[PDB]
Amino acid sequence: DVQAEWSAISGLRRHASNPEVKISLNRQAGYFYRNLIDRLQKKQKGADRVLLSG
Amino acid sequence: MNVSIEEFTHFDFQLVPEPSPLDLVITESLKNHIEVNGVKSGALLPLPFQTGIGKTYTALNFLLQQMLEQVRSELKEENTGKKSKRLLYYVTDSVDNVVSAKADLLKLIEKQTVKGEPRFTLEQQEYLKAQIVHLPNQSEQLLQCSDAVLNDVLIGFNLNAERDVQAEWSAISGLRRHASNPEVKISLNRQAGYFYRNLIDRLQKKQKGADRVLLSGSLLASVETLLPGEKIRNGSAHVAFLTTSKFLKGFHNTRSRYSPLRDLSGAVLIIDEIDKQNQVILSELCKQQAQDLIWAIRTLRANFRDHQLESSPRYDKIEDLFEPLRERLEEFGTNWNLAFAFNTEGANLNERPVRLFSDRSFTHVSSATHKLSLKSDFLRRKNLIFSDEGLLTRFVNEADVIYQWFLGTMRKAVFQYWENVRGLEIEVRENRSLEGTFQEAVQSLLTHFNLQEFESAVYESFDTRGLRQSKLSSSKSYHHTGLKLVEVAHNQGTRDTVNCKASFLNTSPSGVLADMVDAGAVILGISATARADTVIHNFDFKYLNERLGNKLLSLSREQKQRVNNYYHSRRNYKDNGVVLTVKYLNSRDAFLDALLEEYKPEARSSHFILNHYLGIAESEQAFVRSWLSKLLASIKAFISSPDNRYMLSLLNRTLDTTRQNINDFIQFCCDKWAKEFNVKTKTFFGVNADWMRLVGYDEISKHLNTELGKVVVFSTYASMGAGKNPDYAVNLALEGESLISVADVTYSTQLRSDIDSIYLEKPTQLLLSDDYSHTANQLCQFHQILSLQENGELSPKSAENWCRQQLMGMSRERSLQQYHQTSDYQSAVRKYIEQAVGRAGRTSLKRKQILLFVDSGLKEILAEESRDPSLFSHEYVALVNKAKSAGKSIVEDRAVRRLFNLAQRNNKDGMLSIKALVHRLHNQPASKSDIQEWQDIRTQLLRYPTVAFQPERFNRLYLQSMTKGYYRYQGNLDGDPNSFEFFDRVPYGDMVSEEDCSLATLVQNQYVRPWFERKGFACSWQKEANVMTPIMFTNIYKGALGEQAVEAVLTAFDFTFEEVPNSIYERFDNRVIFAGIEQPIWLDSKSSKIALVEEEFGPSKFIYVNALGDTSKPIRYLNSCFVETSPQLAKVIEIPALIDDSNADTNRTAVQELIKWLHHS
Amino acid sequence: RERLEEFGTNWNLAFAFNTEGANLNERPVRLFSDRSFTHVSSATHKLSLKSDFLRRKNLIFSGLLTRFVNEADVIYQWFLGTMRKAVFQYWENVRGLEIEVRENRSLEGTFQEAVQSLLTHFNLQEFESAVYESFDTRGLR
């Protein structure tokens, strides 16, 4: 479902020329960023803290 | 138009189309039902109608008869006021089949003709079509609503006066212009779903206040198109066409969410492909959310301490349903020191937590290697779980019991609220529903006690166990105790507290089906294999039979014969010369090697080709070579034919782009044999179900209606479950004389044809598995283990090992390695085959000679097919008969193995329930309820040592024996109950029989026998096939016969007996008072307990006594320490044998000695 | 804790609250008060609040209701203010430890852990979002 949301948002980007496709893209990008960053932080609070570099 | 019910006033309700044998079979069964089970009672009629005889046609024609009977009943009952409409349904798990069946029904209304004149005029055809309503999901409901409908709703309900509502609706109107982009389509679907949630929430909030917008005309029409679930509330529509998911979940109307499972009293429910619904209902039960049991119990305890419901007439009796729960909560929280939060000592739970598992009866498992206990530390004020590397499982079992007792009491109190409110007789002219009283009842009860946070859990429960209001006595299956999986981890964000997030499953899909039928529905389950013998891919019909009884209707041998006659006369293969031949394809390796050599001239060996070109791993080489040999030999024998044209090869593997080199090699082999036989071949790689759903089969449709050449399709078993005909139009121009008439010529109306070669690969991936989540998958896996153990297919040893392994991450290859050992797997294989070769048989015009190509594995499985063929399809009878004739295999009978496993499971359940019950009679005080349970067990086993038919009330006291009245068992009756073995697997062992309990000796007595025939206790074992389990015999029947015999003797000398007080229950048997003596005497009937009694009652006298034996043994006397002493100095007296072994004469000597020694006090 | 048990004894919080003879589905009672001398109420009368021990309800009948609501609000803000004092006291207690994993020690690395440990202990997890929000409207105090 993560890559369902990200696939839906990748798909919309191709049509941000339509103003109302743009409105839809903005709203969903907001919700998916809430989602993505929530899951990133849950990963980083545990033991498998991904060592970020490069 | 005003097309209304007066349009039928000159309709003749007794002209019916000349009913085909299927309609008559259904009607006979239901009229026989109503005259046996009553008028108001539900039923269930599993209809194994094979394909090709109008399954759905017959279902829709029965649906139309019920619609016309409602119209008649309205033209009659109009003098009575009782518009008691019956809801008819049509549920099935797929959206394509629901839509296609609805559109078939509208075509049936329009074109149904009787006696050359159409059955319905134009107005009647308009009326009835309005009664039918189709309920799709929320996104597809919205994207059906045109701009006019949503605008009219938004104006009428004045929601456009807000901004963000029309922001979302503007964003969704904007996307609709681009639904051609598939990814714009996916965005539009998700967004339309959320906006429909939002819109309908606001509509309902408007309609629950005083400003109920009066709906009529165009606004009513627009809301009904937005809410087809609304037409059902008004009285406008009966017939809902929906999916199982939208049936269990429930549909919306203008005021609330109608949940069809609470309102089944009198529904008629046609479930197409019923057996596939076990999996779908299972998939909905596994989705429901986990509950933290520590938050839940601490919340219940705190908020139930004071808060109270108020003493009006609405709450007229409710507060006394919640008084036992309040008392149990305060007692539980005192024992388990629930003031303090819980934390673990030791092991590292940021890596992995503790996982516990329990099926609420005898299959307990835990992931901890050690027996975790739980200790309350009053200096730290924490409750410390010794993560040791017990008592925690006892805590969690009790906490769960209390939580389910709370939810069950909320349902009892919602119905008591409903009775009280209906009796109020509120303002007239106002209809207020019953599920209208549901949400008000829930919210008023939760608001009073302050438990609003438990609202979601309460709403969800009303569909899993909620159909019940709408221990070792009672009936005791799995299919309605369910299972529980508890995962003890650290609270997220903190470093020192712990949650027990339990995930439940309070029932199985067979429990849901028999709850509907117990609740009133008339389920009509249509499927070709409705009564398969699996319990994983089908309901458990052994349980439904024991649960329902005479409500599980059936077809006689007459009616199954009549349906087979109709089937033969509609698919008359044999008379018209249509041929079926089958070839069992073994492994041929040098075959594939020669193909490989001719595929790659530069390569020097087959392994080299498989490595460098096909991408086959070296360990995987055997498997790929094997099945690729079989598949290409099937293609060879197909295109080698002159005549045959269409083949479907059914595989465990979707030959998509992922294995594209194997696709390519198959393409090249198809090419060589295509050119060699001078035939054009086309192969389709990666036909999954979706390509059929959206695009694909229109292409082979046009291919065969227009082009020359042979067609091959590759797809899987699951992929065929999309819900579509695999048929194409017969083109006589191309085919010529290659097709003939199989049916009766009288109904040859349809010019289409179907698959005419088919290759079947042996399925192995047959366990169910849910992908929804991780806990949803673990609940599916434990459901399948326990459904197999319940049924009999897994011994308790095997079921418990598999449950244990599954807690610690058993890999799916390892799950499937152990399902294959059950006979349930072979019945699910034969189900999958029997459904595969019925797709290859829909149409009414057929080839002369049909190829059914079988894997070589299926020879061993199919050969065992042993049901009665009187409803098998012709292709399946071909596969079976050609396998059977090829020579017989050595068979493990399934009923025999299944009796062995059920003997061990009934014994394990007896053993563990008894040990739990006795341990709970050692809790002081012993509850009177548990004293009653112990007494019911003993009383039942005395009056019925054997039962002639499997009892439904006390069913795990008894075990079904192979030999009537006795059996031989071998085990440690205090040891491990996985280690018993029973019936002549141990030909020498202890015996459970009337001759080893020595009941024939004891009834010879002059005093005891009148006691028995006064009490009803059976004085000699009946010779029947269900006997006491080893536990019940050794530990209760022998004890209770001894007690009754001794007390029956002691009555014969004017003792008077008393109930042993609750303080010491089971420590002592009986209490007596002897004439001339006031001192109370307790009994043991066959120093610690003497001290613990005299600690309460002081100095007293006691009896130890054995009922049967040698009466000549010396009479003994003891002090407190069980040291021998003189009778005058004694507190304890023994009678070694009160009745003679040889002649049952009363030990009058010992009676005199007992009497006198009590007089020596 | 002592003020809560005293408040709930005075105002009988064992019993839920209901109104007598008012059609609040048309218009409710709205009260307003700036916590110092500008009190206003939209009810034409001075609403009282009677605890009825036969009905086991607390009945808002035509004062004392404004006194109930003023006190209940004081107690709720006292709870949130004490949660901030206790998050700071938790932080000052933890900073000196260095167990193994305080990989930031600042005013607010210890914020979510302090909030969740204190709420989980007293069982008040449902007050979590109300505590997170407050940490900036009075939480700079």
What the block records as the tokens of A2 is: 């993560």
Q: What residues form DSSP beta bridges with B356?
A: B366, B486
- The partner residue sitting opposite C25, judged by closest CB among B209, B448, B496, is B209
Nearby residues of A41 by Cβ (< 8 Å), 6 or more positions away: none
Backbone phi, psi, residue B331, to 5°:
-70, -40
Cα torsion C75, C77, C83, C86: sign: negative
A43 exposed, middle or buried (CB, 10 Å; 0-12, 13-18, 19+)? Answer: exposed
Q: What residues form DSSP beta bridges with B343?
A: B384
User: Which candidate, B699, B647, B703, places its Cα nearest to that of B673?
Assistant: B647
What the block records as the tokens of B688 is: 């999954």
What the block records as the tokens of B1012 is: 């028995």
Chain B residue at shortest CA distance from A10: B183
Contact B538, B831 (CB under 8 A): yes
| Residue B307 touches partner C, C-beta closer than 8 Å | yes
Query: What is the CB neighbour count within 10 angstroms for residue B334?
Result: 11
Long-range pairs, A29-38, Cβ under 8 A, ≥24: A31/A5, A32/A5, A32/A6, A35/A2, A35/A5, A36/A2, A36/A6
C18 exposed, middle or buried (CB, 10 Å; 0-12, 13-18, 19+)? Answer: middle
| Closest approach of A51 to chain B, Cα-based (Å) | 17
CA distance B113 to B252: 36
DSSP B1001-1021: HHTTSTTHHHHHHHHT--SS-
Task: List the beta strands (DSSP E) in chain A.
Answer: none
Q: Are B187 and A7 in contact (CB < 8 Å)?
A: no
B190 exposed, middle or buried (CB, 10 Å; 0-12, 13-18, 19+)? Answer: middle
End-to-end CA distance of chain C: 22
Chain B residue at shortest CA distance from C52: B310
Residue from A10, A14, A18, A20 whose CB has the most chain B CBs within 10 Å, to mutate: A20
What the block records as the tokens of A43 is: 């990963």
- The partner residue sitting opposite C116, judged by closest CB among B299, B309, B494, is B494
User: Which candidate, C11, C106, C27, places its Cα nearest to that of C67?
Assistant: C11
What is the distance of C-alpha B1023 from the center of its chain? 34
User: Which candidate, B764, B553, B625, places its Cα nearest to that of B45?
Assistant: B553
Task: Please report the resolution in angstroms.
Answer: 3.2
Long-range pairs, B560-568, Cβ under 8 A, ≥24: B560/B870, B560/B871, B561/B870, B562/B21, B562/B25, B563/B21, B563/B22, B563/B25, B563/B49, B563/B53, B563/B871, B564/B870, B564/B871, B565/B21, B566/B20, B566/B21, B566/B22, B566/B53, B567/B50, B567/B52, B567/B53, B567/B871
Q: Cα-Cα-Cα-Cα dihedral of C70, C75, C77, C80, to 10°? A: -160
Cα torsion B922, B925, B926, B927: sign: negative
Q: Are B495 and C113 in contact (CB < 8 Å)?
A: yes
- The partner residue sitting opposite B341, judged by closest CB among C18, C113, C120, is C120
- The partner residue sitting opposite B187, judged by closest CB among A8, A42, A45, is A8
CA distance B569 to B591: 43
For chain B, the chains sharing at least 3 beta-carbon pairs closer than 8 angstroms are: A, C
Task: Give one word for B433, left, alpha or beta, with left for phi > 0 and alpha for psi -120 to 50.
Answer: beta
Strand pairing class (B522-526; B268-272):
parallel
User: Which candidate, B190, B186, B185, B149, places its Cα nearest to that of B168?
Assistant: B190
Chain B residue at shortest CA distance from C101: B495
Q: Are B182 and A11 in contact (CB < 8 Å)?
A: yes
User: Which candidate, B1020, B1027, B1034, B960, places its Cα nearest to that of B990?
Assistant: B1034
Q: Are C54 and B311 in contact (CB < 8 Å)?
A: yes
Show the CA angle centred on residue B519, arms to residues B516 and B521, nearest 5°: 60
For B:165-224, CB contacts with A below 8 A are 167, 170-175, 177-178, 181-184, 186-187, 190-191
Query: What is the CB neighbour count within 10 angstroms for residue B782?
Result: 25
Show the CA angle centred on residue B555, arms to residues B551 and B557, nearest 5°: 140
Query: What is the tally of helices (H) and strands (E) in chain A?
Result: 2, 0
CA distance B1139 to B998: 12
Q: What is the DSSP letter of B40?
A: S
Contact B20, B60 (CB under 8 A): no
Q: Are B308 and C56 in contact (CB < 8 Å)?
A: yes
Backbone phi, psi, residue B754, to 5°:
-130, -170
User: Which candidate, B813, B806, B814, B820, places its Cα nearest to that of B777?
Assistant: B806
Chain A residue at shortest CA distance from B173: A20
Residues of B in contact with C55 (CB under 8 A): 310-312
**Residue listed under structure tokens 């959320």:** B194
Q: What is the DSSP letter of C61?
A: -
CA distance B85 to B266: 9
Strand pairing class (B268-272; B291-292):
unpaired
Q: What is the DSSP letter of B598?
A: H
Helices B894-921, B774-791: inter-axial angle, 10-degree rounding = 110
CA distance B839 to B754: 8
Q: What residues form DSSP beta bridges with B365?
A: B357
Which strands sit side by side in the sheet containing B1101-1105, from one edge to the other?
B1055-1058, B1071-1074, B1081-1085, B1101-1105, B1132-1135, B1117-1118
Q: What is the DSSP letter of B85?
A: P
CA distance B487 to B290: 10
Q: Which residue type, as a one-letter code, is found at position B623?
A: F
CA distance B553 to C77: 65
CA distance B933 to B916: 12
Query: What is the CB neighbour count within 10 angstroms for residue B183?
Result: 17
**What 3 state SS string does B94-152 have?**
CHHHHHHHHHHHHHHHHHCEECCEECCCHHHHHHHHHHEEECCCHHHHHCCCCHHHHHH
Cα torsion B247, B250, B252, B256: sign: positive
Cα torsion B779, B784, B786, B791: sign: positive
For B:335-374, CB contacts with C below 8 A are 341
| Closest approach of C55 to chain B, Cα-based (Å) | 5
Backbone phi, psi, residue B287, to 5°:
-90, -15
Size of chain A in residues: 54
CA distance B310 to C18: 10
H-type helices in B228-292, by residue range? Answer: 230-233, 244-249, 277-285
- The partner residue sitting opposite A24, judged by closest CB among B175, B182, B493, is B175
User: Which candidate, B695, B694, B697, places its Cα nearest to that of B711?
Assistant: B697
**Residue listed under structure tokens 């239901």:** B30
User: Which candidate, B527, B409, B462, places its Cα nearest to that of B47?
Assistant: B527
SS3 state of residue B313: coil
CA distance C20 to C66: 16
What the block records as the tokens of B983 is: 């019936």
CA distance B289 to B772: 12
Task: List the beta strands (DSSP E) in B493-631.
Answer: 498-505, 522-526, 579-585
**Residue listed under structure tokens 């001339």:** B1076
Contact B1147, B1139 (CB under 8 A): yes
Contact B174, A20 (CB under 8 A): yes
H or E segment to which residue B647 belongs: strand B646-651
Residue from B294, B301, B322, B495 whose CB has the most chain C CBs within 10 Å, to mutate: B495
Show the CA angle centred on residue A43, arms to residues A37 and A44, nearest 5°: 90
Q: Which residue type, as a one-letter code, is found at position C22?
A: A
CA distance C120 to B1077: 63
Nearby residues of C2 by Cβ (< 8 Å), 6 or more positions away: none
User: Which candidate, B706, B635, B626, places its Cα nearest to that of B676?
Assistant: B635
